[PDB]
Design a protein around this ligand. Structure first.
Ligand SMILES: [Mg+2]
Ligand SMILES: [Mg+2]
Lengths: 146, 84
RNA sequence: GUGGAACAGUGGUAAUUCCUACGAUUAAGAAACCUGUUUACAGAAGGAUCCCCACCUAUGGGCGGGUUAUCAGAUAUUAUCAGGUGGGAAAUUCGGUGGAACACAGUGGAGCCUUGUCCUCCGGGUUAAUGUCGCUUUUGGCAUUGGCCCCUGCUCCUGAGAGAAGAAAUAUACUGGGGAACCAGUCUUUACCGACCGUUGUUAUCAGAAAUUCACGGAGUUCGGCCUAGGUCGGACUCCGAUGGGAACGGCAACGGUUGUUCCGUUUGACUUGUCGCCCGCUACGGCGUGAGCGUCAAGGUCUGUUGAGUGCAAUCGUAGGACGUCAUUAGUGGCGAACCCGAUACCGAUUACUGCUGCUGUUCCAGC
RNA sequence: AGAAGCGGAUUUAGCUCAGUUGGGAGAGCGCCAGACUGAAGAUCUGGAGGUCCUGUGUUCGAUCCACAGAAUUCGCAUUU
């Protein structure tokens, strides 16, 4: 006997809103300009407290009651700004739509959230994340060598 | 050393025949009935040798675009009777 | 006895209903997930035709040099894609297999003894020989010896599975229950004769003569001694004796003589790394450099080396349309395809949970005369 | 809320646990009461308190023995 809970990978991307500053047009350069850094006051509990407030103000209470049954952040590190949220397979739609409507953190505004990978296991999501980061290193190395 | 030496007076020298079979792409080796098992037991103790079933032999004949008598021969008398 | 309705028990079998399409990438394995499009070739390996210049011969032609046009199965396309994704039970763990090669106890070694006895089933029948006792060609009974005859139910390596008890019965061997097919335990299987192995301990208190064939009391028979109106004594057998579930070598538990017992070791791996040895070159006291070479040894370095599903904080999806089945309708459509449950190495047997079908059996109710 | 598969151990009063030729159903704690103290704790005495996990069957009789159906719980070089 086991439980069939799905995990969702998300990444915090900062859009470079600079109206007076010029821009360079390339692939890995705009990957550098979007994958810059996470700010100082970002942790597991801060992202959980923000997403529960977004779940309250956006989806309500009983929808928040269905979502908050197994709403946990299993793995997150601020150095790469990628996180894995555990959820049910039925309310995965609700969790992804809550991840979409994330507007701003209470400390830092001007950011979007990208839900990338959903699977019922975390080990294949880690294997996909290593391969996706390997492809990012490939693009960076191709633009760095030439 | 791990061996037993051969003696021309008191050791059972066997006849051994290994031939190629063309269309089924496989090597068949023929031997007397009671001699087969001392040859057969030492075969898959080589760690890269497994055994075949008749459904697996049908799969091998299916893979090499070949034909098989109880299943892929419907034209003949016995094949038609048995299969149908 | 029959037909219908309902319930119950057992045996057998089946379970995503099936098909179709879709679900982001030059960052080319992101619908949840896996595998595959890897035995490289266009008879283009001195390829074929053709352009220009020079040479030799003439009825055809060949050689040398230079750039380069056409052609390589549907005059095409180098950069797409396909298939599958839970079961009888996957739950239960009782079992065994992939280590044994047909009992060749799978093999080897050591120790001990009763030193591994080509032995013996007891037992029953026939035949031959001997000795005794009664009839007297001869036969009958007893004891010994020798010879023969007396039954793998089926498949399977194992585990196990199910078949029938006319050689004495009506209930199909015995015992207990079931409502009946039957179930459980002891057993036997063409037994043309049957065969419940032995030892140890237990059945507490009371009762009874006695809780294990101790013993004791009565009756009957046979034999021996004293003895002879047959009285008594001893030994053997049979039967009975108020009690308790009870006297029945019956029930329960443990151990083995089977082909001597016991112990120890593997016959199980593939890649990676390290050491050692073998051929080549330099150097010569053991040395050094390469072979994408081989053999042995070691290592908690690895095992998607993974399976027409193969995960390992444990995937097995969502939706639309069509085909089929059941049930309910007011105009004709709506709902449902489940219950139990769900891998983690695979196999098979048995058990348990639920739905539907099928055969048998038992009970109740209702009639045809 | 960290499965799956393997072995070992185990279920008895409300609790923690004994125990068993197979013939009585228990101890400590807790509850109540007695005793004691000005009062209370401790000590001590007594009573109440049972689905011996459930079921079959063996036996004359089951916590015990046999079978079936549940499970409890540990370990897998761990403190998640
Ligand atoms: Mg399982
Ligand atoms: Mg299991």
């Amino acid at each position: 006997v086991r439980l069939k809970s799905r995990y969702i990978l998300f990444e915090i991307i900062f859009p470079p809103t600079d109206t007076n500053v010029e821009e360079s047009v390339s692939k890995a350069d705009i990957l550098l300009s979007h994958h810059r850094a996470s700010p100082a006051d970002v942790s597991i509990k801060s992202i959980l407290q923000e997403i529960r407030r977004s779940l309250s103000l956006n989806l309500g209470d009983y929808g928040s009651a269905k979502c908050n049954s197994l709403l946990q952040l299993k793995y997150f590190s601020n150095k790469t700004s990628t996180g894995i949220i555990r959820c049910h397979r039925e309310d995965c739609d609700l969790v992804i739509m809550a991840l979409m409507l994330m507007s701003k953190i209470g400390d830092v505004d001007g950011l979007i959230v990208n839900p990338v990978k959903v699977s019922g296991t975390i080990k294949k999501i880690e294997q996909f994340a290593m391969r996706r980061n390997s492809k990012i290193l490939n693009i960076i190395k191709c633009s760095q060598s030439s | 050393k791990t061996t037993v030496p051969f003696k021309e007076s008191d050791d059972p020298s066997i006849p051994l025949v290994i031939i190629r079979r063309l269309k089924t792409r496989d090597w068949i080796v023929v031997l007397p009935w009671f001699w087969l098992l001392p040859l057969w037991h030492l075969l898959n103790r080589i760690p890269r040798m497994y055994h075949i079933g008749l459904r697996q032999f049908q799969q091998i004949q299916y893979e090499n675009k070949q034909l098989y008598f109880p299943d892929d021969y419907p034209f003949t008398q016995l094949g038609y009777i048995e299969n149908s």
